[PDB]
Structure 1
Amino acid sequence: KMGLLVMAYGTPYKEEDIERYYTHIRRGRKPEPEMLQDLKDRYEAIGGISPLAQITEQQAHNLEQHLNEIQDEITFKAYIGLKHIEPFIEDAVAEMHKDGITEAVSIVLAPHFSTFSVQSYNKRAKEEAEKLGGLTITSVESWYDEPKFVTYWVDRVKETYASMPEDERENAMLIVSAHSLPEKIKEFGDPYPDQLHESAKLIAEGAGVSEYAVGWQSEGNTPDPWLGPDVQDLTRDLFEQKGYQAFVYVPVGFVADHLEVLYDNDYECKVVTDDIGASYYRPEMPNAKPEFIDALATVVLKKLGR
């Protein structure tokens, strides 16, 4: 029996848990009332918070199910570890340990490696495992380049482009993005910016889309400079530059229909496309779909030499 530690940033499971979630993200400081209410407003705006946490749960359960289905060597048992929501990463490691798991494979629900996301989770996990003793975790570090994951986005882009009118098809701009992080990740030689660029190149070339740009989104609000340009500004500059009639956003850095996509893309980016004369396109996110879950299974099996 192999442990399958699936990690993510996490989103509150209940509306009532948003403040604690915000407090945790703020490292122990309660959000100001206005700050808090505004986050609550954004979840409402996208339909409510309830469905969100459930996607991550299904991604992990389905990956567990599929892995145990496609091969008969290893029996996997999924354990979800979240950065800012319970169960926390350490809690999930403590539970695998308590359950008698001695070997575990972990994967983060973010294809691109970065010190702040992927590396941070793996470290916290391997550290709690050492402290407990007798449990070794083999961690996946990046998987933006898994042929099957690339193909999932390639087909979705091909579909969207073949689905637009000719006036737009040949005057469109593809925007591949990921979650922004403080520029100071450079101090650690964080390849994250490069991985989004390769991720973008792979998808555009695969879909045969010639015009594309790389952007960042959802930067947090801190004193430090975050990776840019942001998808909002990038869209505007490319429109003033060449007058694109359609913008196709591929938030490849995200795996589900969370706030960053439903709101930061579907809303804020459409605002710009609306404020300008272009049409808004954002292909279906991976979520827990079979094609995506198979890609992840393949990622996990490869990591194990299977």
Structure 2
Amino acid sequence: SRKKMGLLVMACGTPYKEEDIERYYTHIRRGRKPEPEMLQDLKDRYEAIGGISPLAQITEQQAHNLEQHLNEIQDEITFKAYIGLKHIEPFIEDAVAEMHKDGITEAVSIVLAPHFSTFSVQSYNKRAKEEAEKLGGLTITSVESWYDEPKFVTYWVDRVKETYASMPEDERENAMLIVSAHSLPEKIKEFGDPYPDQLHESAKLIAEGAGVSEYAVGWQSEGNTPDPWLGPDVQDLTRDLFEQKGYQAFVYVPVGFVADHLEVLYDNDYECKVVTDDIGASYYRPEMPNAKPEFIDALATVVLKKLGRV
């Protein structure tokens, strides 16, 4: 008799259509509606990267493929996936309430972001556990980080190796690897937040496995509050490294992100590409994991290790 468990898969969320941009960004901006010029700019950015609908499908495909793969690779537990999002429905609290309604009493959760931080992961896990306590009769064990799962490191190692192998010889010998995640306010350091240290370790592990001796760590997508954010930003970092040593190719691995959305398809593939085009360097950014089987198997291993079953 297989034990039934909920599988709570958490992520940032995306709009589902253009008419959701206003409410999604209002939520991100803590209740402040974007001005009309910003709404129009955002619509244009989503159009430029191919549209909203495909981006909105990825978390669903990740959760569905993870549920089915976990149920196939072991015989003790039957998982059912529930998606809980930060900035649009279904919200984290909606997902926990659905688990409770459906008779789930025991769940494991994972955030689709590999590094722990106090701003994101800790907040998602605390929200899920508080809703479970309010409803009663349900407990959640939560994954806190997974950047160091060997199967996840290997996903990026093999993509980097392929990109370097594809380069002309002069590029391969004069290239720079930039490994990045979403910036946060520097003030997280007051709490001892390990997020920066974990990004640096991701970068070390990926460069090491791929045999890439020249690499750098940067941040992207910072906000505009007056307090300093973690830097350097990838755009400034790229230009500075070019001025120092004249690299002919830049390879971007935004390891903090696991799915296509604006902060990769725009903040790397447009904003960093503007800089590389300006300095005459080639631009490379290997594929995001999305719902590919190699990545799903890494996530399933993370979950089963957390439960002590591997």
Same-fold call, TM > 0.5? yes
Deviates more, 1:180-189 or 1:272-281: 180-189
Deviation, structure 1 residue 85: 1.1
Moved more, 40-49 or 101-110: 40-49
* 2: CA distance, partners of 1:252 / 1:95: 31
1:220 Cα deviation after fit: 2.0
Does the residue aligned with 1:257 lie in a helix, a strand or coil? coil
1:283, CA displacement in angstroms?
0.5
CA distance in 2, matches of 1:94, 1:164: 50
Distance (Å, rounded) in 2 between the aligned partners of 1:155 and 1:144: 16
Alpha-carbon distance between aligned partners in 2 of 1:223 and 1:63, rounded to the nearest angstrom:
40
Cα distance in 2 for residues equivalent to 1:201 and 1:186: 21
Q: Show CA shifts across 1:168-207 (max 9, x none).
A: 0010000000011111111221100000000000000000
The C-alpha deviation readout for 1:227-265, integer Å capped at 9, x for no partner, is 100000000000000000000000000001111111100
C-alpha distance in 2, partners of 1:9/1:188?
23
1:27 deviates by 1.4
- 2:193 and 2:47 mapped to 1: Cα distance? 35
Shift of 1:219: 1.0
Q: Write the distance in 2 (CA, Å) between the matches of 1:54 and 1:60.
A: 10
Listed one character per residue, the Cα deviations across residues 3-57 of structure 1 (whole Å, up to 9, x for unaligned) are: 0000011111121111000111111221111222222221111111110010111
CA distance in 2, matches of 1:96, 1:229: 41
> What 5-or-longer segments of structure 1 have no aligned partner?
none
Deviations 1:140-162 (A, max 9, x none): 00000000000000000000001
Q: Secondary structure at the match of 1:173?
A: strand
Q: CA shift at 1:224, angstroms?
A: 2.4
Q: How does 1:99-248 map to 2 (within 5 A)?
A: 99-248=102-251
Mapped pair 1:69 → 2:55: no
Deviations 1:55-113 (A, max 9, x none): 11100100001001111110000000000010000110111011111110000000001
Alpha-carbon distance in 2 for matches of 1:210, 1:130: 48
SS at match of 1:248: strand
> Identity of aligned pairs, percent?
100
Distance change (3 Å), C-alpha of 1:221 and 1:37: farther
User: Gapped runs of 5+ residues in structure 2?
Assistant: none
Which secondary structure state, in structure 2, belongs to the residue aligned with residue 116 of structure 1?
coil
Show structure 1 runs of 4+ deviating over 6 A. none
* Separation in 2, partners of 1:37, 1:123: 35
Count of matched residue positions in the alignment of Structure 1 and Structure 2: 306
Moved more, 27-36 or 130-139: 27-36
Aligned residue for 1:40, secondary structure, equals: helix
Q: Which moved more, 1:52-61 or 1:25-34?
A: 25-34
1:225 Cα deviation from its structure 2 partner: 1.7
Question: What is the CA RMSD across the aligned residues, in angstroms?
Answer: 0.7
Distance 2:18 2:172 in 1: 41
State how far apart, in whole Å, the 1-side matches of 2:274 and 2:70 are: 41
Q: Give the Å deviation of 1:221.
A: 2.5
SS of structure 1 residue aligned to 2:206: helix
1:223 positional shift: 2.4
Q: Distance in 1 between matches of 2:237 and 2:183?
A: 13
- TM-score scaled by structure 2? 0.97
| TM-score between both structures, scaled by the size of structure 1 | 0.99
Q: Secondary structure at the match of 2:145?
A: coil
Establish whether residue 267 from structure 1 lines up as the match of residue 270 from structure 2.
Answer: yes
Q: 2:43 aligns with which of 33, 40, 48?
A: 40
3-state SS of paired residue (2:120): helix
SS of the residue 1:127 aligns to: helix
> C-alpha separation between the residues in 2 aligned to 1:127 and 1:69?
31
Give the drift of 1:266.
0.6
Hey, what does 1:10 align to over in structure 2? 13
Name the SS for the 2:203 alignment partner: helix
User: How far apart, CA to CA, are the structure 2 residues paired with 1:197 and 1:133?
Assistant: 39
